[PDB]
DNA sequence: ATCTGTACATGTACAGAT
DNA sequence: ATCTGTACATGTACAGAT
DNA sequence: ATCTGTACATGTACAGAT
DNA sequence: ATCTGTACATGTACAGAT
């Protein structure tokens, strides 16, 4: 009941979806078409809508869209970067419109992202119908972010991605553990889909900095979000409704509210809660473990699970098991103890942050 | 335990599967290769394996294989034949065939026939054509006898025809997303090769959904994991095998059952699987009651003379126009008999 | 004259609105 | 409960290219 | 266009554990 | 008797090479 009302608050409004989507699709079209022009390195790039808005778990407002401009790259070989599972050098065998980004067979991420970014910056300059500018580049981000003032503020991450169609990299052989949940035929079909490499683009100052790419599975997560039940009719017009997405929304909101108040939580992001709930959906595969009348209990066990990840400093990438998003190398003890105490306080005092 | 023992008897042998398949595949690849690699009107024909062997519900022996040679044909107009549901006239290479199903089948049949004659490493002949069949049937003697039905089909890539709009009622079983996706697949037209002497009979084709039935047979649970290595086993296919066996044994003994075929059984269990979508209703421990309610459903179809085509609902497969009332009453007494005496027929 | 990338045309699950 | 806008998959038409 | 190579589904088969 | 784990076999989807 309390949580039913929070969900009502988080529910997007069709009126807002219309206005935001009409603007967003205009810009994204125009950008996509410029990538196709003339002697552009990005000709043939294709569009893939990803993230919460397209999974129907975007909350509060339709004010952040994520879009992938993906480029298929044939005849590619990878060098895993220092056994991290998730980061790769991209190498070319033949000796090519990406030639300007080559650094002797090695494909530079930051060179490629700069050119991409330069092109985007130029196209929005020439947009005069709507109020749109290009955010100052954020370190670690694979994206060129647009700020649209639709009056209302809207962010769009244009994510640049390489598309390889070969089999997924060895480091993912043991990830995506959906066999007892969505099953083996689904797993096989998903792993026949391409995989994607986005620029890591860190500024830490370590070797291969600007030639390191990160694996991306936004497309797989989108499929899973919209096909999330052991039963094929889960959440369908002739099936039973579950509370899996509603639990994701509530946890997303807990993090947003908290992250909005306390800058100690800067190391945390929603992909952390998205990853945690993929594990919970694997742990509890049955649709009856997500009955809408047990929303309280399902949300409480998701919190219990997240707390245990924070305390044990272990939250494995759903697709790359050896990659721990909560390692001390990425988020230190005190950042995690701080969020642990904040969650545990909301848990045990009526979730007062839901009323802000 | 009775029925468990029968299903052991009906189980194909890995050795038999290997020898039949390697001989079948040899023939089919060669016919398929002639269809294109020789300047013929079927140059774009592609192979699609269908039926019980490829759905893993073949029983007793691997001795009957069904193959579809499908041909993409664009911008066809369909016209429904006297509101039959399932039979259509086709209008607009193939110029030398209103696209007459008979005329096209015959050249197709002529091509296979010539090719079979030039096969010298397999004992294979072409069966005499049956009025009623969309098929060119090969008889292979690998010592063991094996039938192959080579089924000519047109492939249309538009919306399924109106008569199916109410068909495929999987919504509460496999769901609306599977139904939508299946209906994005192409649909197929095979020759209605009757002899009845009725009106447009030579130019009529029939809708085929073997490709859709294959997916359903191999994706049959309400849970995605049904019958997978990390899921539970269900006894859905086992019931199909048991009901197919009962019919096969009955037909073998009674000439009165000539009008019945396995497709009747297949259609009935599709309705049952829709009626009882829950995987727990097809629990392996309950194989007996599951089979018995299949029997009871099939007898209710006979009693009421009503067994609608699972994809074309106004097409009654048990209409008087197709199976006489006497034939259905005969099958009813025989099934009721087996049912109430522990299936004596399963021992012979 | 035919060929074909681009974009319209069609249909429907998802979920908000009434 | 029904009505309805957006997203998305797939089929097709045609201006502009060959 | 046409074909092999790859990966894993669907099976059968049998021994050791239950 | 059934269950589990490994071996053994064919079918099928699709990437990539020619
Ligand atoms: N750190 C990350 N590692 C891997 N993939 C990530 C990471 N951050 C984001 N992504 C991918 O990019 C998508 C979009 O990122 P974003 O941060 O907008 O989150 P979201 O899932 O869209 O949710 P929201 O935008 O509502 O906070 C994610 O859904 C995920 O697929
Ligand atoms: N009367 C029919 N109407 C529509 N499709 C049919 C009909 N008869 C057969 N088919 C199609 O052709 C396939 C092969 O037919 P066939 O008679 O070989 O049966 P089957 O399903 O292969 O089983 P079995 O051969 O073991 O009896 C069927 O599964 C179905 O897809
Ligand atoms: Mg987002
Ligand atoms: Mg983002
Ligand atoms: Mg068969
Ligand atoms: Mg047959
Ligand atoms: Zn659900
Ligand atoms: Zn099953």
Residue numbers in the entry:
A (entry chain A): 148 to 242, 246 to 506
B (entry chain C): 148 to 239, 247 to 251, 256 to 506
Quote the passages of the study that discuss this structure, keeping the authors' original sentences.
Next, to determine whether Mn2+ is preferred at either metal binding site, we soaked WT-mcGAScat•dsDNA crystals with ATP pre-complexed with increasing concentrations of Mn2+ (0.015-1 mM) in the presence of excess Mg2+ (10 mM); the presence of Mn2+ was tracked via its anomalous signal at 1.8961 Å (6539 eV) during data collection. G The presence of Mn2+ at each indicated concentration for the ATP-bound WT-mcGAScat•dsDNA crystal was monitored by tracking its anomalous signal (contoured at 5σ; the average resolution of maps shown: 2.63 ± 0.11 Å). Here, we found that cGAS specifically favors Mn2+ over Mg2+ by ≥100-fold at the catalytic metal binding site; the binding here also cooperatively increased the affinity for Mn2+ at the first site. Our structures consistently suggest that only one Mg2+ is necessary for productive substrate binding, while the second Mg2+ drives chemistry (i.e., neutralizing negative charges upon deprotonating 2′- or 3′-OH by Asp307). When ATP is bound to mcGAScat•dsDNA at Site-1, its 2′-OH makes H-bonds with Glu371 and Ser368, while the 3′-OH interacts with Lys424 and its own β-phosphate, apparently stabilizing the substrate.
Cyclic GMP-AMP (cGAMP) synthase (cGAS) is essential for the host defense against cytosolic double-stranded (ds)DNA arising from various maladies (e.g., pathogen invasion, ionizing irradiation, and genotoxic chemicals). Upon directly binding to and dimerizing on dsDNA, cGAS cyclizes ATP and GTP into 2′−5′/3′−5′-linked cGAMP, a unique metazoan second messenger for initiating type-I interferon (IFN-I)-mediated inflammatory responses. cGAS is central to antitumor immunity, host defense against an array of pathogens, and regulating autoimmunity. Here, we resolve these numerous fundamental mechanistic questions in innate immunology and present a unifying catalytic mechanism of cGAS. Finally, we reveal how mouse cGAS achieves more stringent substrate selectivity and higher catalytic efficiency than the human enzyme. Together, we set forth a unifying catalytic mechanism of cGAS in which dsDNA-binding pre-organizes the active site into a rigid yet adaptable lock for two sets of keys (substrates and intermediate) necessary to specifically synthesize 2′−5/3′−5′-cGAMP.
